[PDB]
Amino acid sequence: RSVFSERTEESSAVQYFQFYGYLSQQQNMMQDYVRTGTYQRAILQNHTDFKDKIVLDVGCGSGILSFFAAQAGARKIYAVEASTMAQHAEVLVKSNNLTDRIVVIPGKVEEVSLPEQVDIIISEPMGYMLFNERMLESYLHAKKYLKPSGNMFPTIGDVHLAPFTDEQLYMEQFTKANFWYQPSFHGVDLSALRGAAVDEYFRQPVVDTFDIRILMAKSVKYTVNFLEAKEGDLHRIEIPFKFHMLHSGLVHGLAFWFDVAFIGSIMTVWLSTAPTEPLTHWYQVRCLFQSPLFAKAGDTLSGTCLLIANKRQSYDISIVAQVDQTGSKSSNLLDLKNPFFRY
Amino acid sequence: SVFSERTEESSAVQYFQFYGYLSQQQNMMQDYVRTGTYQRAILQNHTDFKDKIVLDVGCGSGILSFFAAQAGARKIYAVEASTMAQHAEVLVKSNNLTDRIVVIPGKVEEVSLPEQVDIIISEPMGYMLFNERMLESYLHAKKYLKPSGNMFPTIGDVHLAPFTDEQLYMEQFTKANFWYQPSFHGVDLSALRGAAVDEYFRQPVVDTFDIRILMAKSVKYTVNFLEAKEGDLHRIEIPFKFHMLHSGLVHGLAFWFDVAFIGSIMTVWLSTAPTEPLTHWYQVRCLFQSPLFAKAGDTLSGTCLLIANKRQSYDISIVAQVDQTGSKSSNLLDLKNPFFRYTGTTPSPPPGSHYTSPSENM
Amino acid sequence: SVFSERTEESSAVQYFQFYGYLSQQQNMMQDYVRTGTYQRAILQNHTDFKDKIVLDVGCGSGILSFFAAQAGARKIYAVEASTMAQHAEVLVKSNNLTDRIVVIPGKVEEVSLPEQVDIIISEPMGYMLFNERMLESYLHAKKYLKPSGNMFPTIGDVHLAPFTDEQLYMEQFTKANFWYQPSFHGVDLSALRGAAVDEYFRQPVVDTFDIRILMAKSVKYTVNFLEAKEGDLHRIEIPFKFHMLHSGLVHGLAFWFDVAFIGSIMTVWLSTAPTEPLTHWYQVRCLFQSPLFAKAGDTLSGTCLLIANKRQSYDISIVAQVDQTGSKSSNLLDLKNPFFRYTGTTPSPPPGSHYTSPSENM
Amino acid sequence: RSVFSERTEESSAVQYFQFYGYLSQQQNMMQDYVRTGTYQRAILQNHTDFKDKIVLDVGCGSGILSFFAAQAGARKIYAVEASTMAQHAEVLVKSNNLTDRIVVIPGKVEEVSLPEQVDIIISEPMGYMLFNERMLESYLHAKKYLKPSGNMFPTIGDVHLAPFTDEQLYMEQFTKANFWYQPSFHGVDLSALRGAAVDEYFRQPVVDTFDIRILMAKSVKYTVNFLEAKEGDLHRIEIPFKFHMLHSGLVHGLAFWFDVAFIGSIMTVWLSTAPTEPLTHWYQVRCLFQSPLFAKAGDTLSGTCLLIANKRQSYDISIVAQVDQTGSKSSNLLDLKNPFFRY
Ligand SMILES: COC(=O)c1cc(O)c2cc(NC(=O)NCCCNC(=N)NC[C@H]3O[C@@H](n4cnc5c(N)ncnc54)[C@H](O)[C@@H]3O)ccc2c1
Ligand SMILES: COC(=O)c1cc(O)c2cc(NC(=O)NCCCNC(=N)NC[C@H]3O[C@@H](n4cnc5c(N)ncnc54)[C@H](O)[C@@H]3O)ccc2c1
Ligand SMILES: COC(=O)c1cc(O)c2cc(NC(=O)NCCCNC(=N)NC[C@H]3O[C@@H](n4cnc5c(N)ncnc54)[C@H](O)[C@@H]3O)ccc2c1
Ligand SMILES: COC(=O)c1cc(O)c2cc(NC(=O)NCCCNC(=N)NC[C@H]3O[C@@H](n4cnc5c(N)ncnc54)[C@H](O)[C@@H]3O)ccc2c1
């Protein structure tokens, strides 16, 4: 009956919150210096957004973002966390003598009761491709506690997509799938599953990094304004694209990364996962076409990337792309819950 | 059903989703030691299959059922609970075996088989043999076994042995010491250092190693799948008395396992020991929170107790003491969250293994 | 002599052995910023050298004396205390300058010059300008300077500025946490963790960095070598009042230095600032034991006090406080045991330096 | 008047013991797992050599070898250390509750007074090429405290030498020296020092590792038996060699490494720094010829490596080698106190 339980299979929320209950996973996020340090400077450089203000921290984990708000001068910080990591955050609040300013509230931000409205919400809700794990919806849901003049850190998110060429990556996944092309594996004919295997392997998003050299067009941008958007905006996300090809070659898929901006009163600070910037634990994400498209320079590649939210805290992705000049069309389904980590 | 009473839905969902992926089936099939040994065991005991009725528990892609067909089975009931059952059906049709192999989608605890069978085949082994608790489904399946029937595999041997690996032990503290700093971005993390140490030590270590890190002949615990009941695997007590062959710090116990296919014609072994070629079961090591000093000739004794839980795994309790000194150590480990440490690098030998000059051996 | 009273033999032995190596001379000579700038300063002020008498203090290979010859000096007394003096003599003969350059082996505090000189040249700068305490030998040498005379360099500017570098700070604790383990080969090391932390923090860090880690306009302390006495460098007090331009954790103070050659024709600068090309002096950073939080507009104030020691270096005392909050930090550092951290990698910019989208800038 | 002060310039002992007073340097030795673990297993596997015995630890540093003797069962351990690291060893003895068994005695083993004789001496006295730092002499000196039936850990040391070919290493050092070949560096003629520069650069031992492929002959061995040898044996060390060349090519120098053996009652354990074994903090050492020697397979390369001990706790090395068939001779002086670390 709570907003989170309606949209989430229990079997997926159990695994999800158990994963973030491990300190080792908190350490891995924290040790991303670009991630942690960029959050810290966005907050401190905009200290006036926090001085003597009331703060809500959505999914605080170890509580590290709350400690940044305390350093900035916040009067009171409500740090909500649904995993068992809440108990460990409490320990750190006590041992850092911040019991009067940081108040850990265990539970799902959709279900807990907060004693007052807040001036600013902070969170790190971004998954792979920004939208994975569907935590952006909890972040937006928490705006019920936001004063009208309130702010949000991060304030906006920019998804970027660009076609790429990478025949090695394409052949690696085709070669894996071609295991099921065999007619006499230990005397057994597997070939009838060759099609299902290629489908499974290519519905996998490839999570790793790559050189910008492989991008064949200026990137297309899709913006979410966290101040303006509703929770229901993210159940069906439609990203049209029209790429002007700058090189000829085989387009093997679309590469995704994202940027978020902390728009404070004093300055705007950007956190970027772009392939031109230092690597973060979000890497970049590439979706492969089962069959590459040929395009020459000056052609336009157009279509739509439709993300339909599912009950496993992820998205069914549909990418349809066509070379307009030739009508060469590629249509793909990617399962954002079973990625292929290649790094 | 028996399966749902002992399994939280969360665990079963993830479990059968995992085995539904063809990529996962392919990983198991591409373990040649595993797949070749099963094939040899079945075909070299063709008399145990010629014109017999067979039950394949958790058939996955069906590969073990196809081996039973190659051996001459009249009828094979291939039970699979993941969505892989539908892909196995496809393979049965395209291999023209629809009259000999019948795929029955569902849990073996819940489905209806139309007759008793002469032999049950399966690959129910997890890490340390027992992980994933599928051995219970294998034993449960004996309700369909004719009284004279057989099981492939027939018996399972778990082997435990003390090891010394200073690097493995110190690695835990090096990772946890991330939290022992007073100003991580202005925050004092040190109150969590102890909790981080505990978390790492609760993890069984899945990788391989050089056998010279073992300090005593292994101790064997045997399950006979023909005799054993489901209930026997809820609480598994493994007493051990190790007679130390080397002096050093015992940092934990190493686990591996063998299974034997005892056919009418011959007995075939599938071994995951560290002295045999590596398999996708590797080996498992459970660390002691505090190491024990032992000299050669000392005895190291205690109990490994495995208590089944509803997440299809086991809580592991290990208590051990050096009898000559009374020095004692324990540990509790969660077999459900193993740490996969395998790098691909050939395991390096323990320091101080050269009894002759390495410069002369050049 | 003045040199032996202020220098323990142990330090002088190692010091003059080090500069006796031609490999070391070559390293200094191959710093093009250093050697080119000195050459330009001397030649572009040829009137300050044409037919003048010159003293080169610590001439090493003699390279600065050859520049003074190229500028027209009548006579050059080239004093060097290491065994490099004999190699400089060889270069004076093979360059046919025996009538203009005279190499006088020995310490400038102890040797006898046959006449007063019109200008003294030297490269006495160490890390943070003052390290190695050769500036005192440069000033001591003014006993040979005619009253109208000049000094090349003429003045030295030390610049200090607060920096934020979370990684540099956390690195100290990560290294020291080697000792925070209870069973390193069966030994509990943790009682030494505190001593290891202290040892690392007493080390000035010699490497370079991105100027965006600086949080305030630098503060300048000037030595005028024409006016300054030897005794002025035994105790050097540098008060500072920084007006913070960025908010963040101040992890310490960064030091660099400039020198100026003020000739009759022009003033030439040799800068080791982080905004200029890298030199073999790099930059020096002294960490605070505990960082200070400061917001933009706050004032950070305190004193850097350098006390000379007999190991030809300085004990550094740094005290600093954020005035708005009273938050205070100190540190004591031994400039004689710096930590050389330079990797060769271009310094990476502080996180949160992007005020516009990096994905748009593509 | 003490044996150490007679053979050591004070200016060299000051630097030497200050270097080993830093915990960071103790950490670097300790973190050599081959070094530390091989000492620990040599001691524990031979526990009977230690059970209820009296032990002397020469230059114990942090005290880690003493703790190994305590684990083996030693009744009493005298842990001598001349650097300020002695104070830190005391701290560890107290915090490990071994005050009744490990007795730190600050000072030089040549100068301190020990209350009784010992059954076994332990130490890590080996430097680069084994003999650098001249600590083997303190180790041997400490035998005045050794019972007649006593043992020593390590018991023997084997130096190995073998000719090598490595034109890249040779050209790197020649290229550095050729800086001083210039006739107009900023208008100055440096060429007169070209000879002195080559001499300086090539008197440097090269400390790093290398592949066995570069060795041109089976290695020659020189043994020191620590039970038998006197302190004065190491003031003048003469190592003759006669190599049977197994490949043709340029011999650019001699490569040195060493092995030590712990000969206990129960078994012998070897610690090796050979290029075929895992790297240690001793690496290997190569001495270059200013001019390479040509040899063909089947030729013999013969000569002598003479090490004369000096007052800087090091050795003046003289290597003379000749290809017997052609009489091609190379003569070299290497200064073991100023090595070139290439790793
Ligand atoms: C299955 O195995 C795979 O193949 C796999 C698949 C994936 O998609 C993965 C994907 C991986 N992803 C990351 O690398 N992720 C890090 C960045 C985000 N980390 C963060 N701080 N955000 C979440 C926190 O917020 C809390 N939280 C959420 N929702 C609520 C709510 N409603 N109420 C209160 N708290 C809430 C959570 O408990 C956390 O405290 C890794 C590994 C992955 C592995
Ligand atoms: C989370 O990340 C980790 O750290 C982690 C942890 C684990 O415990 C893992 C553990 C990992 N696992 C294996 O090591 N896998 C290989 C061993 C052999 N494979 C096998 N045991 N497959 C059984 C088949 O039998 C079916 N089956 C089961 N029960 C029934 C039933 N009642 N009825 C009908 N069919 C049934 C199943 O669907 C299968 O078709 C991997 C990865 C793992 C990763
Ligand atoms: C231990 O390892 C470390 O961590 C470390 C520590 C240091 O402090 C170092 C420090 C390092 N040093 C430099 O940074 N070096 C370059 C700066 C410019 N070079 C210079 N300052 N050279 C002066 C010349 O002048 C002579 N000279 C001195 N005094 C007198 C006198 N009284 N009479 C006559 N001649 C004299 C000398 O012999 C020289 O011919 C390097 C390496 C260092 C390494
Ligand atoms: C100048 O810069 C360079 O270019 C350079 C040159 C070298 O030759 C180096 C060479 C380097 N070498 C090692 O890498 N060395 C580690 C292995 C040996 N470490 C050990 N444990 N042995 C000594 C201990 O024994 C104590 N000790 C000695 N003599 C006595 C005595 N008489 N009484 C009591 N205690 C004594 C000492 O204080 C120590 O506690 C490194 C760096 C080096 C750097």
Author numbering:
A (entry chain B), D (entry chain B): 135 to 477
B (entry chain A), C (entry chain A): 136 to 497
What does the paper say about this structure?
All six cocrystallized compounds (12a–12c and 12f–12h) adopt an overall similar conformation in the complex with PRMT4, revealing two common anchoring platforms, the methyl 4-hydroxy-2-naphthoate and the adenosine moieties, each one occupying the same binding site on PRMT4 regardless of the different linker lengths. On the contrary, distinctive conformations are observed for the linker in each compound (see below for details). On the other hand, the methyl 4-hydroxy-2-naphthoate moiety partially occupies the peptide substrate binding site on PRMT4 and mainly interacts with Y262, P473, F475, and Y477 on one side and F153 on the other side. Regarding the linker between the naphthylurea moiety and the guanidine group, a length increase from three carbon atoms (n = 1, 12a) to four or five (n = 2, 12b, and n = 3, 12c, respectively) brings additional van der Waals interaction with W416 and Y262, thus substantiating an increase in affinity and a corresponding decrease in IC50 values. In fact, longer compounds 12f–12h showed IC50 values in the low nM ranges compared to the μM range observed for shorter compounds 12a–12c.
Protein arginine methyltransferases (PRMTs) are important therapeutic targets, playing a crucial role in the regulation of many cellular processes and being linked to many diseases. Then, another series of compounds (12a–12h) were designed and synthesized, introducing also an adenosine moiety and exploring the distance between the three groups. On the contrary, we were able to cocrystallize the compounds in the complex with both PRMT4 and PRMT6.
